[PDB]
Each structure stands twice: as C-alpha cells, then as structure tokens.
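Re: the multi-chain job from yesterday

Posting the exact lines I submitted so nobody has to dig through the queue logs.
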Amino acid sequence: PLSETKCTLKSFTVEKGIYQTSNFRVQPTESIVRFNLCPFGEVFN
Amino acid sequence: VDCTMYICGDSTECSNLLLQYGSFCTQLNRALTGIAVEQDKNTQEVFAQ
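And the result, structure tokens for all chains:
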C-alpha cells in the first residue's frame, strides 16, 4: 500500500503528509439465489 | 467520489472503457480533493487564529 501512492505522485520523493491511494472494496463471498402446482400427478398417474 | 465505482458499478466491462477517457476519472478526485483539502483551511484560519 505504500508503493501504490508513489505511483500517484509519480515521484520517488514523497513529501511529509497524507496521500490518497486507490480505493479498496470488500468482495463477495458467495451468491445467494432465493425463490400452485401443475397436476402431473393427476395427468401422468 | 470514486469515479471508477460511481460510473461503472463494480464491473470491469465498464471499467475498461473508462480507461479510454483518461484523466477524467482521476482529475475529478484531484478537483474534489482540491476542495476538501482547503475546506479545512477555511476552518483553520477562521477559528484558529
């Protein structure tokens, strides 16, 4: 995370202060899919 | 405001194209940061003399 800021200033000298490096995101663990009756027991049987 | 995420929601398909507009993504942050940096300079000089 230190090396990515020096690429933002393009400089090898990094002045004393706070610099905003690229954002981070939390990433997803998994997908969650969540969802009468036709008379096939009355037709087929 | 993060241009990359705002414009393109979490999707590289849109993220790729954004690379073609160059600095439009970044320079906004530079503008906003340019604002937010001095926003504390305002409060700095007004209240703490």
